[PDB]
Amino acid sequence: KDVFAGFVTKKLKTLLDCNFALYYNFKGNGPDAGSFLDFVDEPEQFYWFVEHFLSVKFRVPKHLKDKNIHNFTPCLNRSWVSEFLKEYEEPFVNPVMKFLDKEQRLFFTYNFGDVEPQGKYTYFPVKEFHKYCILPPLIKTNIKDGESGEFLKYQLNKEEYKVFLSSVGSQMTAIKNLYSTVEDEQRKQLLKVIIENESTNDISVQCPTYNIKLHYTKECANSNNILKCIDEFLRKTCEKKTESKHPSADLCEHLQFLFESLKNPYLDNFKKFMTNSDFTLIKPQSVWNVPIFDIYKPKNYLDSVQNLDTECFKKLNSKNLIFLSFHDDIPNNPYYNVELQEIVKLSTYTYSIFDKLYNFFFVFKKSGAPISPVSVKELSHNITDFSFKEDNSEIQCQNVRKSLDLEVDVETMKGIAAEKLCKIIEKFILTKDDASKPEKSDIHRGFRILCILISTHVEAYNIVRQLLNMESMISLTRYTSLYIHKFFKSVTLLKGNFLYKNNKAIRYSRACSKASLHVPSVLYRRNIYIPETFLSLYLGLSNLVSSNPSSPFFEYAIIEFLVTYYNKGSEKFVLYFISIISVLYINEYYYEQLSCFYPKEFELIKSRMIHPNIVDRILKGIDNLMKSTRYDKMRTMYLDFESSDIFSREKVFTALYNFDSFIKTNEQLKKKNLEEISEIPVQLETSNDGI
Amino acid sequence: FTNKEAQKESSPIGDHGTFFRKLLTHVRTIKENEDIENKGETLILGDNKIDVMNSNDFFFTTNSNVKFMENLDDITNQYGLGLINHLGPHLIALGHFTVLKLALKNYKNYFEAKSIKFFSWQKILEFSMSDRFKVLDMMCDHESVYYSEKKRRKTYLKVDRSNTSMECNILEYLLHYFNKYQLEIIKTTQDTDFDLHGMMEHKYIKDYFFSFMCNDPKECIIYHTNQFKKEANEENTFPEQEEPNRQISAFNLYLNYYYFMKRYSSYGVKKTLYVHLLNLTGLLNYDTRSYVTSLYLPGYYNAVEMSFTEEKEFSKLFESLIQCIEKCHSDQARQISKDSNLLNDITKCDLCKGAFLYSNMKFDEVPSMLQKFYLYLTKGLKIQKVSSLIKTLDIYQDYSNFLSHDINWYTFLFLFRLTSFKEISKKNVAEAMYLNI
Amino acid sequence: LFSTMLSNNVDNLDKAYGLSENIQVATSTSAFLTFAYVYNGSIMDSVTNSLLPPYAKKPITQLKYGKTFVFSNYFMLASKMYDMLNYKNLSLLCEYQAVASANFYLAAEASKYLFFYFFTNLYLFNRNFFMELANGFMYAFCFFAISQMYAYFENINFYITSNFRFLDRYYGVFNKYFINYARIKLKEITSDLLIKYEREAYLSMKKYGYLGEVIAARLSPKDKIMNYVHETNDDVMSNLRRYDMENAFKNKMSTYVDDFAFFDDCGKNEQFLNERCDYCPVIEE
Amino acid sequence: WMDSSPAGFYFSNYQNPYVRKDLHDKVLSQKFEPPKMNQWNKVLKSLI
Amino acid sequence: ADIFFYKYGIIYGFKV
């Protein structure tokens, strides 16, 4: 328990160095790049590094080759932060930040010679000034039909001499054929393609984009309304251009080439814009919805061919646009503020992002014992019925407790589901008494069962209402569990949501949005032979598991599907467990809620559900099979990671009745407007010069 | 089936040794330098030009002489084929009798020691199309994991499968093509009101099919409904007499047989599809009456037409066969089998020689089946690269109207496809079948 | 003539246009509205046809001079043939579509938008008139489609695919769609919500066009190429024509409200959730 | 010929020069007719 | 017409 003056133990430096090596070599064959995270001058990168690498038990990805630091084997299954804050009394954050930055400095000098640090810029894309370009108009005519030998199409990546005329001529094709002055050795084929493809009624331009690359917190700390800090950075990149190591700064130039080419009120307002300190020209081009920046996060999924650069730390969400205009308006939007990361004690941060589930992989390898498949020869020694489970009897209307109501539309259901989950989270957050010090806790036992169970309810409601022709064919909706997923990725960023900057709802919201994803993967599956969409309540299980509910092999097939995930170490096992059980319960909920009160709807939809008496036998078979001399490690592990409130019919049906009661009560208050989840920007008029 | 005294009328010791030696000599005489470039094109049509295409027997596999049919029977019976000659490639009947043969060859294990599981053929058709193969695996006593998650044509090739006796390859082929037949029926009925999805709870398939012809999930006579007669117009014209009670059961034998024999030949396409779909919904449940009705319906014979999809030419498919016979002209066993004793353990190039001798026999001036088929294919339809027989409607319809003159045409196609796979000289039958696609 | 005698649901299409109400205006305003829709939808479907691959257009589309004079005579022939049997209401539609052939320089959206637009513009409360004119308009659109499909003059090969009776299929599909649309929303109708529906329809079309041009400007730099013009060789176009004819009725007219929202951090087995497709075959190599 | 018909002027007028009102009283009370191909036949014959 | 390939017109005239 030293005070951590300036240095650490020797066993910790090895872990830190292997962490640095894994980071720099993550994409492979790159132990030299300039992906230097500047900790001291950008505090939002320190926390990125702490979240993704420093406080995570060590695990090596796909890499089977040999990488410079040798070897990883002393460091596997250890987390740097938990060893640090248990060796010393936990100090402030600035000493730790300086210490890590200094050791990254010495690591980056020991390798890659003496090339300088300070990268990891932030990207702002911009393309159009008023219209028709910003960048040197290397516009491309992407018409088809006429490349020499291959599928390629037409290209006209033209030089800077393209420079156009004034308002004298107003037609794109006209100005196109006009400037054929000389065009050494390319004139005749250019006019060839001109007379060729002026027909077919399509001519494209599409000139490219330019990325401003400023440091976010070094130039936008004060000076709110991000547009302001961007423009003030733009006017500091003029000045007798002779700079050194200030790259991506020729933008003053590119616009000069454009201003001297159009007209002369533009030089006037442009030069009065400089050196007056009050002239905005950034002019947002959309409505700027909630998720502002698109931060980069690694993954064990081998991020696809969409690669931009190994410097892009943040980025504009691509539904928020920017164009450099004069004489325009800036509508009032509450999302222009510059909000930065607040520094924290490095213990409350590590504790505020932590859930036990993601340690499953590290328990598996510590316990071993991988289960073995069943090998049909053994299956004929253990199965004794082969009877095909038909059971087509009647329903007893005595004690079903009418709850269902088929008059609420779907958007209201989505709103009410989101509101109910938000209320549950609000209740779970405040736990008595939250007195310091809060040491370490897990997500309250029984929450995932609530998301998954409340999301299956809404998905099945959507399917049932679509089967009865109660939804207009112009406002249909696939995957109601989208609106939940999205809605919980940005719930701590919405004004007036009662969870605004709580910092405790993140791991509750993240838990909750990684499931909603797991519900419709079961409820929609598209089997291997005739892949199409079906709108049923049991075909998804049959396609996922490759068996029928009446077959004598259904429970074995379900358990084997789960066993394929239990091995290899994987949290998918728990989530798929819960999702399958939930679908089975929701079948027998809807069957007896329709058979007892909607006899017409029931005589239409009777063949899309199973029965309340087949589901009972299936569930009994599952629970009997889990507790028998095999598949037992599975049950112990599940009970170690999640609650045993499934397997209890009466504890699962009270949740459904409670949700129905909540709908009935708080439906006369539901006129909200369904926060939008789309990814296409909402444009503004911008009738500027295009003639 | 055989002990109607043999060694007296249907099996000599076998003069085919000299035949095979001379044939190999001939094919190796043709297999020389480039003076003739089409190998499987000149040894098929040896003598030309004789035996004009069209005279009254171009459509049948034999001429009007009974001795030629008797000789074909004898040749197939001498090798172990036996059953595949008297039954066609009928899915239901060949499955039934191959399971009976399997049960006779391993009687003590099944029904005395009771160490292995045994299912009837009428029960296997009642499982889902992914469980049918697992149920076949735990009956032929083979080792394999139960849960697969992939397709059968990719899981089959993950174990040894240097298999035991041929019944197990025959049943694999039959299950594969029964699955194909089911999927084709389901995909081709598919109106804008029916929609008939995939693995969908056989009971519910029957309920939904009856709730669409006569708008009620109870059974009704489909020949009297208005949905049955949307394309053409029908008449009741049945002996409405009870015999002996009201409410005929829609699976009755008399009703179905009567309507078949009276008017099946003047139906559209939707009506033949509806007839076969009614029979299939009978077979997917237990319903012995559908098991019996499926013995005269024509769609269970011509499911072999789905077997030819490779873009090779007929000559290459003949060359593959020639090369598997010459592959087994070296080893001692087996030179010949005596009869079809049904405990006889048929081997592979026994099947090879049987299919060859069956397809390539002549009677003193008359072309074989290969020559009639090849002449129809090249001079009649003018098609090489035999996978265009099923790519266009008119070609396919003429092809299926030609094949329907004789049921030995289906046996010819069966025996020819079984031994003309590409990797047939190295591997087994079902293994080559799955390698081919 | 033969593909028309050999069907069941042409008389239903005939009886759907302009019933003499009681004693009333006798579809004069309906005549105006249908003529206006012919006039505009002609340009609409023609500019839709403008950006297409080969094998999807008629030979009357490639010739340069005298292109809007052949369609006139083809449609006049079709109207003569429809009149010849008994269908005096299906020949008037072809007469309109032949008169409106001069100006020849996802769809139901524009159909309903134009219908609401012109109706509200003309009547600025009788509720039956609205229903019969809406039925006539919506059936007239499908009639435009089917009438233009009686073409392509490919000697025999185009009509031998597997269906050849497309009229009954199209009628069943559109009948179901219109029954649903009429029963659900357009009910309890008065002179307040017409303006509403018009506003939301115009907003919806503006959103559709905006996203269309956006994805058009976005599709080029991506590494996801779909050819959109495969070949001009006269052997692969027949494959594609047959494939379109076969898989035509394996699609629906339904639109979804969330089709540009996507799932994040999927696995390898959860990718199918991002396809947003019907009858999606899985292809390997 | 089509863009000179009595019913071609208005459909070319979407920027309203007070055209909606007289269009609507021509359609409500007066008889509004689309051009007939019979009219175009005589023009065709004359120019041929 | 007479196309099916020509790029110009081969118009002729008939009556039914």
Author numbering:
A (entry chain C): 25 to 715
B (entry chain A): 196 to 632
C (entry chain A): 972 to 1076, 1147 to 1165, 1200 to 1360
D (entry chain A): 730 to 777
E (entry chain A): 827 to 830, 863 to 874
The publication says:
Soluble RhopH is a heterotrimeric complex consisting of single CLAG3, RhopH2, and RhopH3 subunits, as predicted above. CLAG3 mediates subunit associations through independent contacts with RhopH2 and RhopH3, which do not directly interact with one another. The visualized complex assumes a ‘shallow bowl with a short base’ appearance due to an out-of-plane orientation of RhopH2 relative to CLAG3. From other angles, an asymmetric two-lobed architecture is apparent, with a well-resolved large lobe that enabled confident de novo model building for CLAG3 and RhopH3. CLAG3 contains three visually distinct domains: an N-terminal sphere, an elongated central bridge for binding RhopH2, and a C-terminal bundle encasing an amphipathic helix that later integrates in the host erythrocyte membrane. The N- and C-terminal domains hold RhopH3 tightly through bidentate interactions via a ‘1300 loop’ and a ‘300 region’ that form orthogonal pincer-grasp interactions. The third CLAG3 helix (helix 14) and an upstream loop are closely apposed to RhopH3 through complex interactions. Together, the 300 region and 1300 loop produce an extensive 3700 Å2 CLAG3 interface with RhopH3. The 2005 Å2 CLAG3–RhopH2 interface is much more fragmented (residues 706–715, 787–805, and 920–939 of CLAG3 and 414–435, 580–594, 682–708, and 760 from RhopH2). Thus, known and predicted transmembrane domains are shielded in the trafficking RhopH complex, implicating large-scale protein rearrangements for their membrane insertion.
Remarkably, a single protein complex, termed RhopH, contributes to each of these activities despite their separate timings and cellular locations. The three subunits of the RhopH complex, known as CLAG, RhopH2, and RhopH3, are conserved and restricted to Plasmodium spp.; none have significant homology to proteins in other genera, suggesting that these proteins and the complex they form evolved to meet the specific demands of bloodstream parasite survival. Upon host cell rupture, RhopH3, but not CLAG or RhopH2 subunits, facilitates invasion of the next erythrocyte. Some 18 hr later, CLAG3, a paralog encoded by the parasite chromosome 3, inserts in the host erythrocyte membrane to form the plasmodial surface anion channel (PSAC) for nutrient uptake; other paralogs may also contribute to PSAC or, in the case of CLAG9, to cytoadherence.
